[PDB]
């Protein structure tokens with residue numbers, strides 16, 4: 001009938017541990033499933049728990065089952081960026097249908113080494129159509145606040161990894177179709193560090 | 201010492217299936233394949249316990265599939281009919297005018313298909329009539345009970361007509377007051 | 379050993395019939411359909427086993443239908459679409475008839491149900507070349523791709539370098555932003571960045587391409603406006619290596 | 623409480 | 636009647652309880668046309684073909700670790716669980732036997748007749764019925780029908796005694812049953 005997951009969302013710094021809970025009926029229990037659901041991927045099963053008191057491990061992910069109390073705990077030790085997904089738990093009664101929880105959306109914040117925060121202006125697509133500002137190389141602690149002005153568009157932070165180089169970086173983009181819009185004023189509502197490089 | 205049995209079957213070409221729970225030779229419940237609901241043997245059991253009919257329907261589906269696979273596997277070997285023993289008895293010792301129940305016990309038969317009718321002075325009766333489903337046995341043959349509430353009389357004769365494929369003609373079990 | 383679902387996304391008019399096709403795992407015994415409305419829980423619709431419906435949702439039957447035409451395909455039919463039918467449709471299958479195993483999910487079909495197809499627009503795609511300052515300061519080159527004015531939501535952005543798809547040095551917004559956030563029929567915008575070494579960007583024998591797959595109007599859909607029919611299409615922008 | 627069914631499996635083919 | 640061949644697929648899942656739930660033996664048995672072909676015994680721990688018909692299932696079901704594990708856990712998750720679910724109205728069901736004592740025939744004194752002791756509508760099945768001539772137990776001339784199941788969570792028994800009664804005789808029938816603290820006694824005299 002009803003399955004609840006707590007918390008709905010979760011932030012965790014790379015290397016740190018986290019856990020979250022699942023609550024299911026304490027009656028007509030057959031199985032409890034945990035599924036990992038990455039952004040554009042398909043939900044992939046992590047565990048199928050059937051025995052009360054059993055603990056299952058799939059590397060850095062652990063799951064516990066308490067049938068009498070009607071709860072399950074999912075544990076992520078030494079969280080890695082690849083662990084960022086929605087974790088769904090599903091309860092199985094006598095039939096085959098799964099009753100799902102609302103999930104726990106996990107965001108693993110990556111460790112940023114060598115932070116050189118800066119705001120650049122890219123050369124407009126032929127020509128000009130729009131002006132594009134790129135806020136790059138900032139630390140994970142810097143939060144990218146929304147546009148504030150309706151004519152300007154600002155996207156949330158995004159981590160890019162140059163796998164070969166072992167280099168990770170944050171970035172957010174600002175754009176507007178004319179005219180007063182510039183780099184220095186682009187990210188006003190966001191907490192810009194004083195060290196932020198501006199080329200003139 | 202106690203025994204709990206989950207008995208399930210599927211029969212072809214009749215397309216008849218059954219799912220029941222047995223406690224020490226007595227039925228707890230069964231699943232009605234038409235209504236797809238749990239039928240408790242005594243109403244009170246439904247107040248003290250629960251069952252998801254679906255688990256039974258999922259098992260019947262599998263037994264149905266397994267029957268198709270076992271038929272082919274056996275090279276279409278049919279079942280040998282074992283005719284039943286029929287006994288007619290009463291709920292309590294009989295006394296003229298005080299209400300009683302005629303119990304018709306059908307036993308030691310296979311396949312579990314039986315046509316059972318109650319006759320009063322040769323004519324059929326359906327008033328207050330109840331039956332059980334096919335009950336299990338250690339020898340894997342079946343049991344069945346039919347009930348007729350009646351008022352004992354000297355003017356009335358009763359019969360239980362049983363039809364099984366293992367019987368040459370229909371078996372009749374007589375009862376009258378003595 | 380995976381479940382496949384076609385198409386990735388689908389746009390349909392309110393009241394029309396839709397057929398979500400699926401390919402379960404070959405030797406699997408049980409097949410399922412689940413759906414998830416945005417911000418809601420993944421919900422069960424129907425299960426199927428040995429050519430028959432096992433369990434069905436209280437909504438299903440009055441609206442939906444399933445079919446198993448051959449030993450490879452499984453389909454879901456929505457008789458008449460409603461605005462509330464806008465969801466991600468998951469197909470699943472499991473191996474055991476006993477149910478004591480995991481259900482394997484398909485990648486899902488994103489179904490968008492619209493009152494009218496008039497507001498459907500493909501994206502405009504533009505590439506912004508890396509800042510010379512960024513090159514001079516970090517010896518790195520960030521290209522920026524913008525996909526703007528598309529409706530409805532959900533496009534697939536990809537980066538191609540010298541004809542090969544690249545995933546390294548790339549990051550795209552997980553969710554798009556609204557252009558006119560007040561409006562409910564508001565068009566969307568999505569951005570992405572590709573970062574390479576200044577050496578790599580400076581080599582003029584290096585081609586950079588940004589592709590946006592849009593899911594729009596179908597083959598048999600009605601189109602009466604003067605503008606090009608906003609069909610399913612790939613919109614792209616490019617950039618070449620500058621020695622500078 | 624609930625009476626639990628022991629779930630059946632499909633036979634070998 | 637109808638002469639078409641019949642095909643029967645039957646299955647039993649048995650839970651045998653010893654000393655409450657201290658010892659449990661579990662059996663999942665498969666029958667095709669009365670013939671048991673394959674089974675899982677908790678004391679064996681795996682599926683074993685009973686006949687050649689069971690052979691493919693034995694190797695297939697033992698190769699299905701999720702299904703085989705469900706069976707290895709059945710003694711708890713299934714047997715003991717189900718035992719506890721109904722324990723109060725099942726193992727603890729106690730129904731009072733109704734006792735009647737009557738002669739079968741209207742036969743005169745100093746000649747033979749059958750003294751009937753009817754014990755009816757009781758639960759559980761276990762019952763001890765004893766006949767007493769004149770305070771002393773009669774072990775001989777006792778004709779029992781045995782335990783009769785009414786198929787509705789009640790039992791009955793007719794325990795008859797061969798009697799050539801005298802004018803002073805006082806026949807007494809004793810009923811020992813789990814649902815009774817004080818043993819029931821019904822008496823008949825000539």
Ligand SMILES: *[C@@H]1O[C@H](CO)[C@@H](O)[C@H](O)[C@H]1NC(C)=O
Nearest residue numbers: 271272273274275276277278
């Ligand atoms: C199987 O059934 C057919 C037809 O009745 C017959 O030809 C054959 O002898 C039977 N036995 C075997 C082992 O196939």
Ligand SMILES: *[C@@H]1O[C@H](CO)[C@@H](O)[C@H](O)[C@H]1NC(C)=O
Nearest residue numbers: 313314315363364365636637
């Ligand atoms: C029971 O009744 C129906 C209809 O008369 C019949 O088709 C069937 O064969 C009978 N079953 C027996 C005699 O077992």
Ligand SMILES: [Cl-]
Nearest residue numbers: 046047048056
């Ligand atoms: Cl597992």
Ligand SMILES: [Cl-]
Nearest residue numbers: 238249250251
């Ligand atoms: Cl119930």
Ligand SMILES: [Mg+2]
Nearest residue numbers: 027028623624
């Ligand atoms: Mg329960």
